[PDB]
Design a binder for this molecule. Structure first.
Ligand SMILES: CCCCCCCC/C=C\CCCCCCCC(=O)O[C@H](COC(=O)CCCCCCCCCCCCCCC)COP(=O)(O)OC[C@@H](O)CO
Ligand SMILES: CC(C)CCC[C@@H](C)[C@H]1CC[C@H]2[C@@H]3CC=C4C[C@@H](O)CC[C@]4(C)[C@H]3CC[C@]12C
Ligand SMILES: CCCCCCCCCCCCCCCC(=O)O
Ligand SMILES: CCCCCCCCCC
Ligand SMILES: [Cl-]
Lengths: 33, 193, 51
């Protein structure tokens, strides 16, 4: 096995950034009077 | 204006619940899956380990990954720091599941009070997940971990091994929990208006 | 507390705070089945699929 973890970390960071961005959109919806 | 106000509050509450369930799934996955740290090209032996479970290769140019560890039996956990981290990551999971249970209180109890109850249960969950992430690196001196990663490994030092998806997913879970906690606080104060 | 409330007024419930004890049976009617259902979901998924 090629003991390299770059694609795995990349997809994990992508999913995490997506979820965090959705939560900042939730703040955007709230704080926008 | 008020009907738009109520519609936005309701929708954002629904999305907050959805993201709470997503974070609960993340917490369960990181607690269970043993992919917090893993071998590298320069490592002596192959394998990986999580909070309590660890799998190591015998060292014969094959997989043959002998696997040992279980949270039910605290004897098999390599070190005390691992035990403490596994406890905190569980207390965090039991506290996020408690909020998902407390969603049922929205029928009867005042909505602001329930929002704040989950705000405080999510804040504590993030604090536990943060204490669990700070304490887990302290057990990297354990001889079992040192045997796989190598001599260079130590307390608060990766050495030759590299972090795998579970660790960064737990960090993302910390951030998500904190953001959801503030979201719940703002929603709870927003229903009162 | 950017809303303009006190730290206590923003991050704590003190409007009347318990007083709602007669409705304890009402909460437990749906709380306890919900807790048991969640416990079974994590319990069975953990042992059969994840590990
Ligand atoms: C795979 C894992 C699955 C996990 C599933 C977990 C499920 C856990 C158990 C059930 C909880 C059900 C809760 C339902 C609550 C419904 C409550 C409701 O009608 O919402 C109103 C507004 O609240 C709100 O916007 C708050 C809304 C909160 C909604 C909470 C439930 C969402 C469930 C979404 C599930 C998606 C799953 C996705 C998986 C990926 C409050 O009422 P109401 O105006 O009358 O008050 C008037 C007041 O004077 C007295 O209460
Ligand atoms: C009361 C409600 C809100 C929360 C209940 C929390 C439940 C789901 C928690 C509490 C203790 C947990 C268990 C603790 C230890 C282990 C051993 C591990 O190798 C697999 C997961 C498993 C089996 C956990 C599954 C989830 C669990 C049963
Ligand atoms: C088991 C159920 C635990 C219920 C805990 C109390 C829920 C909140 C009680 C009403 C709050 C309020 O409006 O004063
Ligand atoms: C896809 C793996 C899901 C693991 C169980 C999720 C439980 C969420 C909290 C009830
Ligand atoms: Cl176990």
């Amino acid at each position: 096995d090629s003991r390299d973890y770059s694609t795995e970390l990349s997809v994990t960071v992508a999913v995490g950034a997506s979820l965090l961005f959705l939560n900042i959109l939730a703040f955007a919806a709230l704080y926008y009077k | 204006y008020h009907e738009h106000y109520m519609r936005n509050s309701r929708a954002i509450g629904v999305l907050w619940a959805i993201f709470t369930i997503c974070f609960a799934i993340i917490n369960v996955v990181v607690f269970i899956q043993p992919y917090w740290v893993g071998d590298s090209v320069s490592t002596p032996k192959p394998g990986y380990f999580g909070l309590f479970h660890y799998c190591v290769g015998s060292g014969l140019a094959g997989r043959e990954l002998t696997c040992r560890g279980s949270f039910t039996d605290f004897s098999t956990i390599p070190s005390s720091a691992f035990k403490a981290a596994a406890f905190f990551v569980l207390l965090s999971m039991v506290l996020i599941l408690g909020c998902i249970t407390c969603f049922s209180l929205f029928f009867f109890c005042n909505t602001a009070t329930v929002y704040k109850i989950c705000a405080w249960m999510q804040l504590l969950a993030a604090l536990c997940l943060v204490l669990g992430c700070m304490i887990f690196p302290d057990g990297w001196d354990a001889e079992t971990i040192r045997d796989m990663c190598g001599a260079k490994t130590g307390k608060y030092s990766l050495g030759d091994c590299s972090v795998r998806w579970a660790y960064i997913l737990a960090i993302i879970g910390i951030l998500n929990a904190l953001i959801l906690s503030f979201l719940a606080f703002v929603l709870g104060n927003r229903q009162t208006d | 507390c950017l809303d303009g409330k006190d730290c206590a007024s923003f991050f704590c419930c003190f409007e009347d705070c318990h007083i709602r004890i007669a409705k304890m049976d009402s909460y437990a009617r749906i709380f306890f089945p919900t807790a048991f259902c969640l416990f079974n979901l994590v319990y069975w998924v953990s042992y059969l699929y994840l590990g």
